[PDB]
């Protein structure tokens, strides 16, 4: 769920910080 949120970000090339 948090895992799914993170994965949605990565599948969409969102830049994570640090």
């Amino acid at each position, epitope marked *: 769920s*948090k*895992r*799914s949120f*993170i*994965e*949605d970000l*990565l*599948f969409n090339k969102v830049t994570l910080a640090d």
Partner: antibody
Amino acid sequence: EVQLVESGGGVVQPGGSLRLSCAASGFNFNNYALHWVRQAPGKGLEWVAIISYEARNKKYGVSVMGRFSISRDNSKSIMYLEMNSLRVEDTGVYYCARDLFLSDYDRSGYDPTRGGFDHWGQGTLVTVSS
Amino acid sequence: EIVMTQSPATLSVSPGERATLSCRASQSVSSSLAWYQHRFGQAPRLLISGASTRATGIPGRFSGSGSGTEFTLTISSLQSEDVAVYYCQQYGDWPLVTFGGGTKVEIKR
């Protein structure tokens, strides 16, 4: 103890369709992204597709996009690759693989250094030919 | 998207000597890098993930190092069972993972 058993390879005519299966055992199937990887004669490993642990996200190699469809049954622990409009150049050995990425999330959170395909199927031969 | 480039294409190493394989990423992958052994007629086998963490059951004569865009796999005391094609794979860009083109390791005679 972790095991991935592939099935469904065979001969198909150009333009035809084929469904590959990857039956998993010995681990919590629902905790892992899984991929398909293939090898054409004389060529290196080529990534085909990924499906996320809860089946919500999917991506495809540029060579197969729009023709292949990846899915998973998270109650019988089986992954599928549906291949439509097959081309002669789709010929090769097809492997399923278990991805470690984010699989330890519940215990250790987000660690993008953890990854790799730690278990692979035995491979199934797909022959596209008239 | 991220292109992985392995060298040399073929590596010839004397029995019992050390094989050094190189992998370059076209942009930084931090240490999100894995190495695989692919023996002829078998399924690929994970050797290293996280650039330098040996996978379970992998002997200590296999090791890796590097971060950013340059990586190395070292195989000490090369044995004929090590003859295989070796692939690197980045997952810094996960889920868009990508493989190197492979390095063939052979016994020199």
